[PDB]
Design an enzyme around this catalytic site. Sequence first.
Site, PDB file in Angstrom:
ATOM      1  N   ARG A  84      78.144  47.880 -11.002  1.00  0.00           N
ATOM      2  CA  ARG A  84      78.058  47.336  -9.669  1.00  0.00           C
ATOM      3  C   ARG A  84      79.135  46.274  -9.510  1.00  0.00           C
ATOM      4  O   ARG A  84      79.042  45.171 -10.039  1.00  0.00           O
ATOM      5  CB  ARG A  84      76.676  46.754  -9.362  1.00  0.00           C
ATOM      6  CG  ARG A  84      76.564  46.341  -7.910  1.00  0.00           C
ATOM      7  CD  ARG A  84      75.243  45.690  -7.559  1.00  0.00           C
ATOM      8  NE  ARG A  84      75.214  45.364  -6.133  1.00  0.00           N
ATOM      9  CZ  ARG A  84      74.149  44.869  -5.509  1.00  0.00           C
ATOM     10  NH1 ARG A  84      73.035  44.648  -6.186  1.00  0.00           N
ATOM     11  NH2 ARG A  84      74.220  44.591  -4.218  1.00  0.00           N
ATOM     12  N   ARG A  93      76.399  50.102  -3.157  1.00  0.00           N
ATOM     13  CA  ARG A  93      76.261  49.721  -4.552  1.00  0.00           C
ATOM     14  C   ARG A  93      75.897  50.918  -5.421  1.00  0.00           C
ATOM     15  O   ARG A  93      75.126  51.790  -5.026  1.00  0.00           O
ATOM     16  CB  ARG A  93      75.251  48.564  -4.762  1.00  0.00           C
ATOM     17  CG  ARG A  93      73.762  48.893  -4.597  1.00  0.00           C
ATOM     18  CD  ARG A  93      73.298  49.184  -3.177  1.00  0.00           C
ATOM     19  NE  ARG A  93      73.687  48.132  -2.249  1.00  0.00           N
ATOM     20  CZ  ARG A  93      72.984  47.029  -2.006  1.00  0.00           C
ATOM     21  NH1 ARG A  93      71.779  46.843  -2.560  1.00  0.00           N
ATOM     22  NH2 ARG A  93      73.483  46.106  -1.201  1.00  0.00           N
ATOM     23  N   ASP A  96      71.079  49.036  -7.473  1.00  0.00           N
ATOM     24  CA  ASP A  96      70.334  47.846  -7.082  1.00  0.00           C
ATOM     25  C   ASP A  96      68.988  47.913  -7.801  1.00  0.00           C
ATOM     26  O   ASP A  96      68.302  48.927  -7.741  1.00  0.00           O
ATOM     27  CB  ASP A  96      70.114  47.857  -5.570  1.00  0.00           C
ATOM     28  CG  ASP A  96      69.386  46.628  -5.067  1.00  0.00           C
ATOM     29  OD1 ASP A  96      69.692  45.540  -5.554  1.00  0.00           O
ATOM     30  OD2 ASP A  96      68.567  46.781  -4.125  1.00  0.00           O
ATOM     31  N   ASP A  98      65.576  45.646  -7.851  1.00  0.00           N
ATOM     32  CA  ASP A  98      64.877  44.556  -7.171  1.00  0.00           C
ATOM     33  C   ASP A  98      63.498  44.371  -7.781  1.00  0.00           C
ATOM     34  O   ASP A  98      62.820  45.357  -8.095  1.00  0.00           O
ATOM     35  CB  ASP A  98      64.720  44.851  -5.683  1.00  0.00           C
ATOM     36  CG  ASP A  98      66.032  44.829  -4.934  1.00  0.00           C
ATOM     37  OD1 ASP A  98      67.012  44.291  -5.495  1.00  0.00           O
ATOM     38  OD2 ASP A  98      66.069  45.358  -3.812  1.00  0.00           O
TER      39      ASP A  98
HETATM   40  N1  LIG Z   1      62.663  39.892  -5.783  1.00  0.00           N
HETATM   41  C1  LIG Z   1      63.999  39.898  -5.996  1.00  0.00           C
HETATM   42  N2  LIG Z   1      64.619  40.832  -6.743  1.00  0.00           N
HETATM   43  C2  LIG Z   1      65.942  40.865  -6.972  1.00  0.00           C
HETATM   44  N3  LIG Z   1      66.790  39.966  -6.447  1.00  0.00           N
HETATM   45  C3  LIG Z   1      66.297  38.968  -5.686  1.00  0.00           C
HETATM   46  C4  LIG Z   1      64.867  38.868  -5.414  1.00  0.00           C
HETATM   47  N4  LIG Z   1      64.656  37.782  -4.606  1.00  0.00           N
HETATM   48  C5  LIG Z   1      65.871  37.235  -4.402  1.00  0.00           C
HETATM   49  N5  LIG Z   1      66.841  37.945  -5.020  1.00  0.00           N
HETATM   50  C6  LIG Z   1      68.261  37.544  -5.010  1.00  0.00           C
HETATM   51  O1  LIG Z   1      69.114  38.491  -4.398  1.00  0.00           O
HETATM   52  C7  LIG Z   1      70.374  38.231  -5.032  1.00  0.00           C
HETATM   53  C8  LIG Z   1      71.436  39.209  -4.558  1.00  0.00           C
HETATM   54  O2  LIG Z   1      71.072  40.507  -4.954  1.00  0.00           O
HETATM   55  P1  LIG Z   1      71.419  41.838  -4.107  1.00  0.00           P
HETATM   56  O3  LIG Z   1      70.907  42.912  -5.024  1.00  0.00           O
HETATM   57  O4  LIG Z   1      72.946  42.035  -3.679  1.00  0.00           O
HETATM   58  C9  LIG Z   1      70.475  41.812  -2.594  1.00  0.00           C
HETATM   59  P2  LIG Z   1      69.932  43.427  -2.004  1.00  0.00           P
HETATM   60  O5  LIG Z   1      69.116  44.124  -3.083  1.00  0.00           O
HETATM   61  O6  LIG Z   1      71.105  44.330  -1.410  1.00  0.00           O
HETATM   62  O7  LIG Z   1      68.957  43.065  -0.791  1.00  0.00           O
HETATM   63  P3  LIG Z   1      67.354  43.036  -0.936  1.00  0.00           P
HETATM   64  O8  LIG Z   1      67.052  42.046  -2.052  1.00  0.00           O
HETATM   65  O9  LIG Z   1      66.876  42.572   0.452  1.00  0.00           O
HETATM   66  O10 LIG Z   1      66.942  44.433  -1.195  1.00  0.00           O
HETATM   67  C10 LIG Z   1      70.015  38.183  -6.506  1.00  0.00           C
HETATM   68  O11 LIG Z   1      71.016  37.640  -7.382  1.00  0.00           O
HETATM   69  C11 LIG Z   1      68.774  37.301  -6.418  1.00  0.00           C
HETATM   70  O12 LIG Z   1      69.126  35.908  -6.552  1.00  0.00           O
HETATM   71  N1  LIG Z   2      67.706  53.222   2.705  1.00  0.00           N
HETATM   72  C1  LIG Z   2      68.288  52.122   2.187  1.00  0.00           C
HETATM   73  N2  LIG Z   2      69.077  51.361   2.889  1.00  0.00           N
HETATM   74  C2  LIG Z   2      69.555  50.346   2.169  1.00  0.00           C
HETATM   75  N3  LIG Z   2      70.418  49.399   2.647  1.00  0.00           N
HETATM   76  C3  LIG Z   2      70.692  48.581   1.595  1.00  0.00           C
HETATM   77  S1  LIG Z   2      71.814  47.255   1.798  1.00  0.00           S
HETATM   78  C4  LIG Z   2      70.701  45.939   1.346  1.00  0.00           C
HETATM   79  C5  LIG Z   2      69.404  46.035   2.082  1.00  0.00           C
HETATM   80  O1  LIG Z   2      68.422  46.327   1.440  1.00  0.00           O
HETATM   81  C6  LIG Z   2      69.279  45.749   3.522  1.00  0.00           C
HETATM   82  C7  LIG Z   2      68.151  46.158   4.197  1.00  0.00           C
HETATM   83  C8  LIG Z   2      68.012  45.868   5.528  1.00  0.00           C
HETATM   84  C9  LIG Z   2      68.975  45.153   6.234  1.00  0.00           C
HETATM   85  C10 LIG Z   2      68.745  44.761   7.624  1.00  0.00           C
HETATM   86  C11 LIG Z   2      69.200  43.522   8.046  1.00  0.00           C
HETATM   87  C12 LIG Z   2      68.960  43.074   9.322  1.00  0.00           C
HETATM   88  C13 LIG Z   2      68.255  43.832  10.220  1.00  0.00           C
HETATM   89  C14 LIG Z   2      67.796  45.063   9.816  1.00  0.00           C
HETATM   90  C15 LIG Z   2      68.036  45.508   8.535  1.00  0.00           C
HETATM   91  C16 LIG Z   2      70.097  44.758   5.540  1.00  0.00           C
HETATM   92  C17 LIG Z   2      70.250  45.056   4.203  1.00  0.00           C
HETATM   93  N4  LIG Z   2      70.044  48.903   0.501  1.00  0.00           N
HETATM   94  C18 LIG Z   2      69.333  50.021   0.873  1.00  0.00           C
HETATM   95  C19 LIG Z   2      68.456  50.858   0.104  1.00  0.00           C
HETATM   96  O2  LIG Z   2      68.165  50.696  -1.063  1.00  0.00           O
HETATM   97  N5  LIG Z   2      67.973  51.910   0.869  1.00  0.00           N
HETATM   98 MG   LIG Z   3      67.707  45.514  -2.706  1.00  0.00          MG
HETATM   99 MG   LIG Z   4      69.001  43.690  -5.158  1.00  0.00          MG
END
Ligand SMILES: Nc1ncnc2c1ncn2[C@@H]1O[C@H](COP(=O)(O)CP(=O)(O)OP(=O)(O)O)[C@@H](O)[C@H]1O
Ligand SMILES: Nc1nc2[nH]c(SCC(=O)c3ccc(-c4ccccc4)cc3)nc2c(=O)[nH]1
Ligand SMILES: [Mg+2]
Ligand SMILES: [Mg+2]
Length: 159
Positions: A84, A93, A96, A98
């Site tokens: 990533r 990415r 991911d 989470d």
């Molecule tokens: N429950 C959780 N799991 C994983 N990351 C988390 C988390 N809560 C906060 N984060 C933060 O999110 C930061 C950025 O990670 P990203 O993976 O780029 C966000 P994302 O997964 O695209 O969005 P999302 O967390 O809304 O799904 C991590 O370094 C962490 O600090």
């Molecule tokens: N289906 C699907 N769509 C994805 N989009 C991404 S980008 C980070 C994110 O979670 C994300 C999710 C939702 C918003 C949002 C933000 C604002 C308003 C509405 C939606 C942004 C980022 N990750 C995935 C995934 O894992 N699955």
């Molecule tokens: Mg995520």
């Molecule tokens: Mg994440």
Amino acid sequence: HMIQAYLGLGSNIGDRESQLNDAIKILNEYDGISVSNISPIYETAPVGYTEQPNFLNLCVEIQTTLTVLQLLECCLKTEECLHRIRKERWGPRTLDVDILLYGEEMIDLPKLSVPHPRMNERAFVLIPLNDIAANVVEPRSKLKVKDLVFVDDSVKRYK
Ligand SMILES: Nc1ncnc2c1ncn2[C@@H]1O[C@H](COP(=O)(O)CP(=O)(O)OP(=O)(O)O)[C@@H](O)[C@H]1O
Ligand SMILES: Nc1nc2[nH]c(SCC(=O)c3ccc(-c4ccccc4)cc3)nc2c(=O)[nH]1
Ligand SMILES: [Mg+2]
Ligand SMILES: [Mg+2]
């Protein structure tokens, strides 16, 4: 003593299924993590920024002796293992990972919220999560996953 936690996995670059299966393998290799249940994979239209590829998403259950922060570091390390490179949170990415749930524990640190604070309005999370964790209580809402899950046509059974 192990605690039960749930992780959400996603990929929208390249051979998505391979990257997800390598991620599960790698997660199961950390000392203190054992992958104990694996949901089906769903193909999902991208949410947020839409000029990017379709995602594969799944959820896993783990049994872990790691703390929540140790677990987070393992999740991030796994992303690094899957190359990533992109870090735009809105953008594509390779992987991911989470943290969705860590027992019934709750935290909202500036950079870490568990339960994941966006899970309850994401079908790309709740649908695979319900497949493996229907009766698990989400501690913010205090509802079982089966009472949070909803229909979404943008989420399709994959494979
Ligand atoms: N429950 C959780 N799991 C994983 N990351 C988390 C988390 N809560 C906060 N984060 C933060 O999110 C930061 C950025 O990670 P990203 O993976 O780029 C966000 P994302 O997964 O695209 O969005 P999302 O967390 O809304 O799904 C991590 O370094 C962490 O600090
Ligand atoms: N289906 C699907 N769509 C994805 N989009 C991404 S980008 C980070 C994110 O979670 C994300 C999710 C939702 C918003 C949002 C933000 C604002 C308003 C509405 C939606 C942004 C980022 N990750 C995935 C995934 O894992 N699955
Ligand atoms: Mg995520
Ligand atoms: Mg994440």
